């Protein structure tokens, strides 16, 4: 092959569509008996499945009346809605494996390794090996669920689950603790907190989201408190164990205090995932991997060995599916001869919670650590014509220029669809737009995109 | 004063807010009791809070089984979703009379006439005039209903309606047929439809709006229909009037000859707006209208009478909202001196049907016309993420760019969430930016966005997905 791709999640499949496309002979290197890694099987796909259900479910509930639309209230079929999930997720597997096909990529059912010299063993389940020959490797095996630091813990995936166990629970838990208040703790705590769990998130750091804009993890914590959410913020874990029924989780304020025990039917772990490079023959290949466990990679995504490269969840830079993608593009251009190009300063990053946040470019607390000075503008969506109309007036706008050149430097977004809107603030700053650029482009009234416009306006006047 | 408006409709009342904000001491002269004009008060406001209601209205009959959420029959209560629109209307006129207070602009009440040689007076509900002296005039009159070419029609505003009365109708029809297919027929036709009425568009072009990209349109009829409503095209309304208590639209082929009758229990007419001058004096004046009824303009909104300015549907160009404010700004910014420019190439326009639609830029049928080669790129959301999670697959994205550079020249999206998605082409195009530009900015995945961006890449070169 011209190409060998061990992990079919979204860095790696699409990767390995590019290389197809600029005429390379592909193959993709997969353990799993489906496609799409990661986010297509176990992440993205099906926890935004049942998140849509769940906000309808929530929304039959407390949305409707108000409209003048009048339904007895809502009952949960948990085993049709967790279909939907399935379906969708079936949906986005064979898609993929229609891809392959069309693409003419070979796929490979078994776990692969690198050995070096333009080789990679594949070895399936049932035992039997394949030498497999090119010229070029891309490693893009993802992530794998982390634990506690300090805590050992048992992960059954029914008691103690992880965003996989959590993802197919049986039955709606009466209590469930999320010990992370990142984003895959937050949403799926939504999830079973609209289905009639009483949900507790515990966290180590003193506010919710990873180095998210500070503003906007506090309003959305403010919100996802009213929607019955409980959080216990600077709280270490020492503990999360089986216990009779259900499950203990012991924690103590992070700068030291009293212990407190928590009971829940189910504990949710998502603390930050790892990369995963278990198996592979690293150590052996000469792929060094750097302090955190990460395929060390230089600019043009080549490990410490020629002719392997490494992208997506297991290299360094933000977990995401579509950063993961954009290094699958650019490492086939680069491995084709064109110089391919990442833009790391515009990478959106979205929470499907509701209200949904989603931000792109730099963060308050980033420019604050900068040194560099700037405005802010905002503007409320209790002030917009559309979201009045719908009844989602939660949450704003928000947008960070240079003090000097009026250059935006970061957009934040919380409210309804704040993931799609954020993408016309990425093309902005795709064009090094000023905040006076946005605010001048004419925007459709009355839509929630305005609120995005008149944000912008304030942050230039 | 510096400035006197004449209408508080979206282009009125946002040229005087600017012009306050530029330092201008402004009065805004209205005929109705509340500001905001045909947009907020019997427009844009209302239509999107029906649309809205009727939508979750269809979706919780519709939309929820597949998703494991039971609701037995959903109830309308017509009486409280009218009240929604009248909160919504309510907050967005507060609001604008809310930003006259906070920009010490100051309101008459009365009709306004265009005197010249700076001055304008106001003749208020009473029969008093005043006479107001300005260096400056904005005419702001906005847009009124038209009729049907060469019919006469009586509207009552319950059986024969226009815009205004479908807004309000007492209950729902059985039957309803709109006559125009234009936005606001098949917007108003959409919400009565989803409410139980049976609705008929009948239009005289060959397809529905206007106008906009023969493919979209094509395949929001298709849609529409689907949904069961009705569309008689090339068809030329002859009569319409009540055989109570309900109504009679006669009709013929354009082209062929022989005549139908379509009985309903109320018809809407919805054709073409039309710019509305009636008593502004401009004869008088020395204001030229066009043959259209439009105040001439030049590059400076400036009519044929010095320091007479005319902005938003009374002049050239698309009758929406935002277009008349970005021509209210601009000619706030040209009065006080400063560069005012509004970009006719990016004006986005937006139709709230279900699935909706948005286009900005060209239209195929405006690049064909044009001679200019150019390249299409679709991508549909049967085959998006976000989009089969939401059960929301229908419509696409196209995007159109030059052959030789790759600038792309237009952008239509129908689907859920098209108006807010359109915004991104928009900036694209604000900056002369290529498809490839477009696709290669990072998408967040799952986002319907990404059909956008794979649209891009499919003008530039392959989609990916
Ligand atoms: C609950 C949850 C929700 C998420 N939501 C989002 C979201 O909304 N948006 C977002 O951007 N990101 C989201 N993510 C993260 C997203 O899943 C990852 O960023 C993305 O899947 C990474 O793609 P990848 O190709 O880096 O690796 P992965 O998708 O993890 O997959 C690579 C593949 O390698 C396979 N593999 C590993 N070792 C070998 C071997 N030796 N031989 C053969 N095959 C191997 C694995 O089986 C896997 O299929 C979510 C994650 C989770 C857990
Ligand atoms: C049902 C419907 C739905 C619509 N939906 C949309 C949409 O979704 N998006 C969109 O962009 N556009 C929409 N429009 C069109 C939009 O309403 C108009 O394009 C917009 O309101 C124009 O603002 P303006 O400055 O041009 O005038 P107008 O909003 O018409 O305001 C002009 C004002 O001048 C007043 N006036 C007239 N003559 C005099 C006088 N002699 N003295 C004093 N006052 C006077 C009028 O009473 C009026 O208040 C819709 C229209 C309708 C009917």
Same mark, same amino acid.
């Given at each position: 092959?011209?190409?060998?791709?061990?992990?079919?999640?979204?860095?790696?499949?699409?990767?390995?569509?590019?290389?197809?496309?600029?005429?390379?002979?592909?193959?993709?290197?997969?353990?799993?008996?489906?496609?799409?890694?990661?986010?297509?099987?176990?992440?993205?796909?099906?926890?935004?499945?049942?998140?849509?259900?769940?906000?309808?479910?929530?929304?039959?509930?407390?949305?409707?009346?108000?409209?003048?639309?009048?339904?007895?209230?809502?009952?949960?079929?948990?085993?049709?809605?967790?279909?939907?999930?399935?379906?969708?997720?079936? /949906?986005?597997?064979?898609?993929?494996?229609?891809?392959?096909?069309?693409?003419?990529?070979?796929?490979?059912?078994?776990?692969?390794?690198?050995?070096?010299?333009?080789?990679?063993?594949?070895?399936?389940?049932?035992?039997?090996?394949?030498?497999?020959?090119?010229?070029?490797?891309?490693?893009?095996?993802?992530?794998?669920?982390?634990?506690?630091?300090?805590?050992?813990?048992?992960?059954?995936?029914?008691?103690?689950?992880?965003?996989?166990?959590?993802?197919?629970?049986?039955?709606?838990?009466?209590?469930?603790?999320?010990?992370?208040?990142?984003?895959?703790?937050?949403?799926?705590?939504?999830?079973?907190?609209?289905?009639?769990?009483?949900?507790?998130?515990?966290?180590?750091?003193?506010?919710?989201?990873?180095?998210?804009?500070?503003?906007?993890?506090?309003?959305? %914590?403010?919100?996802?408190?009213? %929607?019955?959410?409980?959080?216990?913020?600077?709280?270490?874990?020492?503990?999360?164990?089986?216990?009779?029924?259900?499950?203990?989780?012991?924690?103590?304020?992070?700068?030291?205090?009293?212990?407190?025990?928590?009971?829940?039917?189910?504990?949710?772990?998502?603390?930050?995932?790892?990369?995963?490079?278990?198996?592979?023959?690293?150590?052996?290949?000469?792929?060094?991997?750097?302090?955190?466990?990460?395929?060390?990679?230089?600019?043009?995504?080549?490990? /410490?060995?020629?002719?392997?490269?490494?992208?997506?969840?297991?290299?360094?830079?933000?977990?995401?599916?579509?950063?993961?993608?954009?290094?699958?593009?650019?490492?086939?251009?680069?491995?084709?001869?064109?110089?391919?190009?990442?833009?790391?300063?515009?990478?959106?990053?979205?929470?499907?919670?509701?209200?949904?946040?989603?931000?792109?470019?730099?963060?308050?607390?980033?420019?604050?650590?900068?040194?560099?000075?700037?405005?802010?503008?905002?503007?409320?969506?209790?002030?917009?014509?559309?979201?009045?109309?719908?009844?989602?007036?939660?949450?704003?706008?928000?947008?960070?220029?240079?003090?000097?050149?009026?250059?935006?430097?970061?957009?934040?977004?919380?409210?309804?669809?704040?993931?799609?809107?954020?993408?016309?603030?990425?093309?902005?700053?795709?064009?090094?737009?000023?905040?006076?650029?946005?605010?001048?482009?004419?925007?459709?009234?009355?839509?929630?995109?305005?609120?995005?416009?008149?944000?912008?306006?304030?942050?230039?006047?």
């Amino acid at each position: 092959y011209d190409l060998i791709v061990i992990g079919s999640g979204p860095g790696g499949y699409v990767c390995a569509i590019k290389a197809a496309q600029l005429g390379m002979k592909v193959a993709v290197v997969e353990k799993r008996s489906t496609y799409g890694g990661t986010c297509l099987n176990v992440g993205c796909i099906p926890s935004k499945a049942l998140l849509h259900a769940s906000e309808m479910f929530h929304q039959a509930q407390h949305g409707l009346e108000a409209l003048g639309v009048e339904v007895a209230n809502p009952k949960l079929n948990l085993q049709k809605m967790m279909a939907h999930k399935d379906a969708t997720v079936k /949906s986005n597997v064979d898609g993929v494996s229609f891809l392959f096909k069309k693409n003419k990529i070979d796929g490979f059912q078994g776990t692969g390794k690198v050995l070096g010299q333009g080789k990679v063993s594949v070895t399936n389940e049932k035992g039997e090996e394949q030498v497999l020959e090119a010229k070029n490797v891309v490693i893009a095996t993802g992530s794998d669920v982390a634990g506690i630091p300090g805590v050992e813990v048992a992960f059954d995936e029914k008691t103690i689950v992880s965003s996989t166990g959590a993802l197919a629970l049986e039955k709606v838990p009466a209590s469930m603790i999320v010990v992370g208040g990142g984003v895959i703790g937050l949403e799926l705590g939504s999830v079973w907190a609209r289905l009639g769990a009483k949900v507790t998130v515990v966290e180590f750091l003193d506010t919710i989201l990873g180095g998210m804009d500070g503003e906007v993890a506090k309003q959305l %914590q403010r919100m996802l408190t009213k %929607q019955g959410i409980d959080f216990k913020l600077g709280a270490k874990v020492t503990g999360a164990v089986k216990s009779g029924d259900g499950a203990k989780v012991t924690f103590e304020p992070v700068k030291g205090g009293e212990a407190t025990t928590l009971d829940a039917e189910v504990v949710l772990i998502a603390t930050g995932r790892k990369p995963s490079t278990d198996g592979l023959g690293l150590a052996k290949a000469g792929v060094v991997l750097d302090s955190r466990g990460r395929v060390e990679i230089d600019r043009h995504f080549q490990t /410490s060995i020629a002719g392997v490269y490494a992208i997506g969840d297991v290299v360094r830079g933000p977990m995401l599916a579509h950063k993961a993608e954009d290094e699958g593009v650019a490492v086939a251009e680069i491995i084709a001869g064109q110089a391919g190009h990442v833009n790391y300063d515009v990478i959106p990053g979205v929470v499907y919670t509701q209200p949904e946040v989603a931000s792109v470019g730099k963060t308050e607390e980033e420019l604050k650590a900068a040194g560099v000075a700037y405005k802010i503008g905002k503007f409320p969506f209790t002030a917009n014509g559309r979201a009045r109309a719908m009844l989602q007036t939660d949450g704003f706008v928000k947008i960070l220029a240079d003090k000097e050149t009026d250059r935006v430097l970061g957009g934040h977004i919380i409210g309804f669809g704040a993931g799609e809107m954020i993408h016309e603030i990425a093309v902005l700053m795709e064009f090094g737009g000023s905040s006076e650029d946005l605010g001048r482009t004419c925007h459709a009234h009355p839509t929630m995109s305005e609120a995005v416009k008149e944000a912008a306006l304030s942050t230039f006047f």
